[PDB]
């Protein structure tokens, strides 16, 4: 692997709303990201806030 | 028929003959540096004790007698070291 031409590639972790967690390596210098739909969340992988205001007005 | 026009030929060119060919045949005794074959490409490839010129001309690298052989489908020209009497 060459020295300078490549960008940074540092460890990171991923936290998702379903309680699932990751620990991988990537180029995100922040070292941690948040994801709102993951493999565990998606309905298609599980076999299955517009509405917030919509229910906050009508009910 | 009785009507006539003007006609001519646009051909009529050629270049000088180059005198290319084999100059020393099999069995001939040659000196060192003697031209053997004149050619364009490598129709004949060099063998043992034979070089190649700038224009693909094969000459003898050592005195001896000319031999014609083949090596993996390539027509080669070789020099054999005739023994001293």
């Amino acid at each position: 692997m060459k020295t300078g031409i490549h960008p940074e590639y540092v460890d990171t972790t991923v936290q998702c709303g379903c309680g699932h967690s990751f620990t991988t390596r990537s180029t995100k210098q922040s070292g941690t990201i948040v994801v709102e739909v993951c493999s565990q969340c998606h309905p298609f992988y599980t076999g299955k806030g517009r509405v917030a205001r919509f229910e906050k007005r009508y009910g | 028929a009785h009507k006539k026009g003007a006609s001519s030929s646009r051909n009529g060119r050629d270049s000088a003959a180059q005198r290319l060919g084999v100059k020393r045949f099999g069995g001939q005794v040659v000196k060192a540096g003697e031209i053997l074959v004149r050619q364009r490409g490598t129709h004949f490839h060099p063998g043992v004790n034979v070089g190649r010129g700038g224009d693909d001309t094969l000459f003898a690298l050592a005195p001896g007698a000319v031999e014609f052989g083949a090596k993996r489908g390539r027509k080669t020209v070789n020099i054999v070291p005739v023994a001293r009497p």
């Binding site: - | 028929a1 009785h2 006539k4 026009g5 006609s7 001519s8 030929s9």
Partner: protein, 136 residues
């Protein structure tokens, strides 16, 4: 009239007229055929006259094959001019014929009409010929 769609070299030497035919000396498609007996150049204007004489004599039935095609050109230079100053332009197309070569073929149900239909075509060619069949 038959003309090739294209040829590489348009002005060529005269075809040689020596020897007997090396191949194509037997009937392969039809039942009857015409076999040449001497050398000549057969122009495309005599091939078209020969195959119309066959068609008219048999009227409706039967099929006609032509085994020779006018590939080779002959050049004629302009009339009433001296010798030299180039070479003439091609004027007509010929087919080098040698003895033994089969020119035309025909497959017709009967014999008399089929055999007489070929004789009418022979009288249109500048050579001598004969009628041949598939038997030995």
């Amino acid at each position: 009239m038959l003309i090739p769609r294209k040829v590489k070299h348009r002005k060529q030497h005269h075809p040689e007229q020596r020897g007997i035919a090396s191949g194509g000396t037997s009937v392969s498609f039809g039942d009857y055929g015409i076999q040449a007996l001497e050398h000549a150049y057969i122009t495309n204007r005599q091939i078209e006259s020969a195959r119309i004489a066959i068609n008219r004599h048999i009227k409706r039935g039967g099929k006609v094959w032509i085994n020779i095609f006018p590939d080779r050109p002959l050049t004629k230079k302009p009339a009433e001019t001296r010798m030299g100053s180039g070479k003439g332009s091609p004027e007509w197309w010929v087919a080098n014929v040698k003895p033994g070569r089969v020119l035309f073929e025909l497959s017709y149900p009967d014999e008399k009409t089929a055999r007489d239909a070929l004789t009418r075509a022979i009288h249109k060619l500048p050579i001598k010929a004969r009628i041949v069949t598939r038997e030995e």
